Design a protein around this nucleic acid. Sequence first.
DNA 1: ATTATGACGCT
DNA 2: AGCGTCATG
Length: 430
Amino acid sequence: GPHMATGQDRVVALVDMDCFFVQVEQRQNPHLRNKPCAVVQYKSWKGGGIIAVSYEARAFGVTRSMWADDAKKLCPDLLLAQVRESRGKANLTKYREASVEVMEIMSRFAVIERASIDEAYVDLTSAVQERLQKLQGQPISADLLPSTYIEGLPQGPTVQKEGMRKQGLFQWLDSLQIDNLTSPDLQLTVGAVIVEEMRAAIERETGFQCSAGISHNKVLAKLACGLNKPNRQTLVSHGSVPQLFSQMPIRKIRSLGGKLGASVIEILGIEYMGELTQFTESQLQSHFGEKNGSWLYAMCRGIEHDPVKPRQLPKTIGCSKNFPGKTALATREQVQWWLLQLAQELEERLTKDRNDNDRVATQLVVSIRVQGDKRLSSLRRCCALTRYDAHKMSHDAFTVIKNCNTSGIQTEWSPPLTMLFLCATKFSAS
DNA sequence: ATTATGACGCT
DNA sequence: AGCGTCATG
Ligand SMILES: [Mg+2]
Ligand SMILES: [Mg+2]
Ligand SMILES: [Mg+2]
């Protein structure tokens, strides 16, 4: 009754750039704009591997993780942009720098959590309180929500998409109680007004379009963001959760798209996230552990407490390269050359990070994969990172991994290495 | 021979 | 610490 908390205490948004690497390339090269186009890494093997796809190209069935030659079978007119190559490897600096552009704009509106290169969570609770104080009880005009969908509406007693969007928005705004400054639905609505403004600012100042979700917590905001892409935002109210979850496959919720979600489905014999409500918190903890069980019990009712962390910068700076099939590194000279290439990219990025952000990394993590290991990482080992010097870092990494060489010969490396990864971690202020 | 990242949990 | 899981541009 009155004591069951409803998880409506915060307003949280998730902003996600649409097809981000494609947009970065389309800004640079106007010939790619409003075209089926994709971004690829490398070229020789099957035309390169696609990592980002414009919505025009998605209409033909082009997806990430598809080889460009195969995508061209689906979409003969597909345009491609290649990721930069430096020191023999893909270099993602252009997209990291574009990400910083966007994150700095978002940070003007609220403190953000950088969830990935192209997405950030926003805690809007305080900004919403402020805007409500300025509103003085004035209703919210639909004109202030020109790209907002209200999930679950319209409902009840036109055949165009924008018409449906506006009917739903109208139903939502008509049912709104604008004099209660503590109404969660009103708070979400003002949150959506702010996110319209943030998305307008991102597009004006960068050229980049994004989608967003507005709800009461991170998981619902992420889910909402995905409901209407691209270039749109979606409000998921607490009240919309029972219907939304009643047909929502468990794998769609962040953290349940892998083994844990599969085990929820198999152990409980259910398919949809709403079906979780029929289990006690202790039942879910018995199957999935204390933490997961409590999380699932609350999440299937729309409630989640994970805070938006005040963190706009990545916690690690890493450099990785796979050496698949026949390109696996089989000589010590080879291993040392590539460790050096990775370490030189790492040094460049670290020195820039130190100048920009007033911090220094203090641990170097070295990870490798050996031929025939099913796992993505075969071995992970840390050592001290005391100097931003590529030759030192690569010599230290070699010292850390050199006992992996099974070869009786010092010149040969066996089993050959199919992946090298250098990562700088544990930053301290400087 | 989907690749290059990045965050976080477990023990 | 080192390993596994989840996300996926
Ligand atoms: Mg995106
Ligand atoms: Mg994203
Ligand atoms: Mg994506």
